[PDB]
Amino acid sequence: ARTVVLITGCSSGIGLHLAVRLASDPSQSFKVYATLRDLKTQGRLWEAARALACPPGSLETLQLDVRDSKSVAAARERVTEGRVDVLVCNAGLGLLGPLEALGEDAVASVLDVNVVGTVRMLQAFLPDMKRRGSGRVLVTGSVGGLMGLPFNDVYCASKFALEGLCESLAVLLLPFGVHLSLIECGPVHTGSPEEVLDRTDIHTFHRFYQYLAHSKQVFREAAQNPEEVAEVFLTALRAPKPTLRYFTTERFLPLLRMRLDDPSGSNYVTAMHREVFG
Amino acid sequence: ARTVVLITGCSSGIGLHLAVRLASDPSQSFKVYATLRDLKTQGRLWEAARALACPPGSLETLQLDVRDSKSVAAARERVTEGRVDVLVCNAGLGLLGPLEALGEDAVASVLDVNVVGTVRMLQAFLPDMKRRGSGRVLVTGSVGGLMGLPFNDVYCASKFALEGLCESLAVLLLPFGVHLSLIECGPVHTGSPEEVLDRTDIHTFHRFYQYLAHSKQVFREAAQNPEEVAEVFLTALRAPKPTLRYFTTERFLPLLRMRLDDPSGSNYVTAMHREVFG
Ligand SMILES: C[C@]12CC[C@@H]3c4ccc(O)cc4CC[C@H]3[C@@H]1CCC2=O
Ligand SMILES: C[C@]12CC[C@@H]3c4ccc(O)cc4CC[C@H]3[C@@H]1CCC2=O
Numbered sequence A, B: 001a002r003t004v005v006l007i008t009g010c011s012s013g014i015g016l017h018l019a020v021r022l023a024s025d026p027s028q029s030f031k032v033y034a035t036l037r038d039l040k041t042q043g044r045l046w047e048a049a050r051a052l053a054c055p056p057g058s059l060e061t062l063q064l065d066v067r068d069s070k071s072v073a074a075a076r077e078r079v080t081e082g083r084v085d086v087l088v089c090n091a092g093l094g095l096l097g098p099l100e101a102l103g104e105d106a107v108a109s110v111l112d113v114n115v116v117g118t119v120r121m122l123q124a125f126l127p128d129m130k131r132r133g134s135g136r137v138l139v140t141g142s143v144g145g146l147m148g149l150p151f152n153d154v155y156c157a158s159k160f161a162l163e164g165l166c167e168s169l170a171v172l173l174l175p176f177g178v179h180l181s182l183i184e185c186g187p188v189h190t191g192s193p194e195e196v197l198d199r200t201d202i203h204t205f206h207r208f209y210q211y212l213a214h215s216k217q218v219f220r221e222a223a224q225n226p227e228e229v230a231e232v233f234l235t236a237l238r239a240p241k242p243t244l245r246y247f248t249t250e251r252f253l254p255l256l257r258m259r260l261d262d263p264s265g266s267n268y269v270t271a272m273h274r275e276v277f278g
Helices: A013-023 A043-051 A069-077 A104-132 A153-173 A193-199 A202-222 A226-238 A253-261 A266-277 B013-023 B043-051 B069-078 B104-132 B153-176 B193-199 B202-222 B226-238 B253-261 B266-277
Strands: A003-007 A030-036 A059-063 A086-089 A135-142 A178-185 A245-247 B003-007 B030-036 B059-063 B086-089 B135-142 B178-185 B245-247
Touching: A003 A013, A013 A030, A013 A043, A013 A059, A013 A226, A043 A059, A059 A069, A069 A104, A086 A104, A104 A135, A104 A153, A104 A178, A104 B104, A104 B153, A135 A153, A135 A226, A153 A178, A153 B104, A153 B153, A153 B266, A178 A226, A193 A202, A202 A266, A202 B153, A226 A245, A253 A266, A266 B153, B003 B013, B013 B030, B013 B043, B013 B059, B013 B226, B030 B069, B043 B059, B059 B069, B069 B104, B086 B104, B104 B135, B104 B153, B104 B178, B135 B153, B135 B226, B153 B178, B178 B226, B193 B202, B202 B266, B226 B245, B253 B266
Parallel strands: A003 A030, A003 A086, A030 A059, A086 A135, A135 A178, A178 A245, B003 B030, B003 B086, B030 B059, B086 B135, B135 B178, B178 B245
Antiparallel strands: none
C-alpha cells in the first residue's frame, strides 16, 4: 500500500520538482497524482520524470483548475485508490506592481486562486482525512505570508491569508490525527512600463523600478535550488509529529524575530524600507 | 479647514459610533463622510447623530458598496473638498463554521468584501494622498488577523490578509508621508445541528458545539463596546507619529506572545486548543 499524494500546480517550479522527487523515491512508497491547471503544460514534468527514472505507475497527471470546484471534484474522482494520504496545496499566483496600477481582475484572481482555491481543495479532500483519522496536508507558504513586501501587497495579502486559514484549521485538527503544515519558502529557482507610468505617480514609478533592481539582486543571491525546497516537504512528511511551519531557509528568521519584538509594528516597516530602498 | 474623514460601514457598530463621535466633537475639527453599503439603512446613524447634536455640515452620508469599484469611484467624486485627510476602511463580514460546511460563494464574498473591498478603497484614495504627500488610513483589524481561531478559518484568512496588505504598503508609503494603521479589535458587541453533522463528521460536530459554548462565555467576559473601539481610532488619527498597529485590548497578549516565541507554531496551536477546548 503506497502513500497516495495529490499535488496542485505541477507544471513548473516547486510542484514539478516535488512530484518527481516523490515519484522517483528509492523506496517506491509514493503514488503521485501531479495536477496541472492545463494538461497541455505537462511536457516539462514528464521530461523531469524520465530524467529521474520515475517507475511506471508512480506518477499520473490530472487536470485540476483550483478556481473550479467541479474541476477539483472530477480530479478527486480520478484517484483510483479512493483516498489521499498526502494533499499538497501548492498552486499559486504572484502579483507585482504599484497597488493602484493593478487591475481589479488581477487582484480578484490572486485571491481566488491562492486563498479560495486552497479552500476548495480542503473542502474536497479534508473530510475523508478527518473521518479516517489520518492524512497530511502541506501548503506551500512564503516569507511574504510572514512579513509585508513592498509592491507585493496583494500577493502578501494572499499568503498572509493562508497563514490565517491554515493556523485556524491546525488549532481544530490538533487531535484528529490529520496534520497540516505550511512550508515557508523564500525565493526559489524555478503591466507594461507605459501602463505603470499612466496608472501611478512619478515617485512611485521610480520606486517600483528601484525595487525591481533590488529584487533581481536578492534573487541572484538567495534563490534556492528547487530540489532543496522539495526535500523540506519530504522532511515534513517523515516527521511523526509535524510542526505547523517549516522554513526552507533561516535567512529571514532574524527579520521575523525583530518584527515580533515590536507589537506596534513600525520597527519592521523602517528596517524593510531601508533594506529595499537603501 | 476641517479634517476630512471618510468612513466605510457606518450603518451600525464601530463605523456608526466613530462617525458621530468625530462629527459631534466640540472643537468641530472634523468633517465626516459616513458611507453605507445601502443608504436606505442610514436611519440609526442619523438618530445617533441627532442624539449628540452633530452640527449641520459636520456629517454627510454617501452610498459606498466596497464590492463595486464604480460605487467607490462615485463616492470619492462626491467629496466636495476634493481631498480626504483620514480614510477609515471599516467595512467587514464575519463567517463562522466548520470550513467544509461553508458555501464557496459565502467564502468568496467574505474575501471580496474584507480584502478586495479594502484594496478598492486604497486604489481609489491613496493616489491623491501620495501626490499631495500627506494622509492617514485606518483599517479595522482583528486579533484574529494576528492569530488563527478555530472555526473562523475564512474570517481569520481575511483579517490576516489585511495585515499583509497594510504592512506591504506601509513599507512603500514611509517616504510619501502617508500613514497606515490597523486597529486590532478583540470581540465586539453588535445551520441546523443535523446539517452540521451531515456536512462534517462526528469529531468536528462535537468540537463545534464545544467551541460555540466557549465563545459565548468569552463574548460575555471580554467583548468591548463599539464606542470604546471608536476611541482607539481617535487616538490613532491624532497620533503625531502613528504606528502600524493599535490594540483595543491587552487581553490576548499572552496567546500572542506564545505565538511569537515559537515560529514553528507548536506552542501556539497547543495553547489555543487548550484555551478553546479545555
Ligand atoms: C523584498 C525582498 C526582495 C524580494 C524577495 C522575494 C522575491 C520573490 C519572491 O517570490 C519572494 C520573495 C521573498 C523575499 C523577498 C525579499 C525580502 C527582503 C527583500 O529585500
Ligand atoms: C477563539 C476565542 C473565542 C472567539 C474570539 C473572537 C471572536 C470574534 C472576533 O472577531 C475576534 C475574536 C478574538 C478572540 C477570540 C477568542 C480567543 C480565545 C477564544 O476562546
